[PDB]
């Protein structure tokens with residue numbers, strides 16, 4: 001059994017194993033870091049089954065849960081939030097915070113999302129690039145989702161820049177473990193204080209809603225509110241940063257499609273849909289353990305065996321998406337959903353917010369900077385390490 005996670009084939013490409021497995025062995029066994037074996041599911045139809053089967057569990061203290069690193073094994077000890085829950089506990093807690101992320105709520109947020117993107121673009125303009133390229137990640141891709149989710153949670157404007165840097169330090173590949181855990185503690189301590197404050201005078205933010213509607217009535221206590229706030233911050237922020245940077249790099253690689261976006265910004269929604277299919281930047285979140293024996297394709301998965309469902313592979317599934325390895329914002333879409341945001345009950349709570357952010361970015365960025373160019377040769381883009389989810393560490397641009 002091959003070791004898993006697989007490495008990406010190159011900077012921007014998924015692992016090569018997935019295409020071979022989809023063709024010859026779509027439900028296979030892989031070896032995890034601790035020597036345990038898990039089942040790996042690679043086809044779109046089987047990923048959807050894994051994501052919805054009531055015979056499968058996300059509870060991480062069940063025997064056989066497929067942890068991918070040693071830190072995940074000890075993270076499993078903590079009291080769980082809804083990301084790690086099965087029905088009916090899952091939707092009991094998830095529903096406490098879902099109101100902010102509904103399509104209607106996200107529509108109402110659209111002026112604020114646009115103003116955030118406008119302000120940060122204008123800041124970048126004023127900084128200019130007269131002394132060399134600027135890092136689109138540091139200057140733009142990192143603060144845009146950070147400022148928005150921090151603001152929704154309830155962080156005041158003056159604290160945004162410090163907390164944005166601390167969260168970036170958490171996931172920066174060159175941070176030492178001491179730097180990353182210090183940044184982590186800094187975030188948790190800040191959130192505990194903000195929870196104490198909002199318990200005394202609620203405002204109009206997510207933490208206030210949790211304090212007023214759940215903590216004070218005693219449905220949860222204040223430490224649960226901190227953990228839930230923390231989950232909403234760290235679950236998707238690094239992914240959002242990567243998607244923004246990957247969209248710029250991808251457009252630099254497909255000049256003809258960038259030219260269409262420049263001439264018709266209203267193509268931004270379709271560009272975003274294809275971006276999220278092609279660059280599946282969160283590819284290791286659909287994990288389960290079997291509560292009962294379950295048959296997947298031609299394989300029997302026994303109770304207490306772990307399953308990893310690759311939505312990355314599913315998003316390149318030839319049986320669903322014609323020419324899946326071509327980036328084509330003008331593709332015709334089949335009836336089946338792309339799985340960039342997962343599937344089923346656990347499907348990303350922030351799918352609509354994330355797409356609204358991405359759509360706002362790519363309908364605005366080239367109207368503001370029509371001559372935006374990646375400043376280094378495209379073969380020299382600093383992608384995330386090949387053993388990690390696809391992403392971009394820094395992206396020098398001029399404009």
Ligand code: HEM
Pocket residue numbers: 051082083084094149231232233235236237239240243281282283285286311339340341342343344345346347348349350351353354
């Ligand atoms: C492009 C941006 C993003 C992508 C590609 C993405 C992707 C995903 C994926 C693949 C999952 C697993 C879903 C499943 O189990 O089927 C997920 C879950 C989740 N994501 Fe996102 N995400 C993004 C942005 C965000 C943001 C901005 C937030 C929070 C503000 C967020 C919060 C969550 C949470 C809380 C879950 C767990 C949901 C549950 O189990 O009920 N994500 N996301």
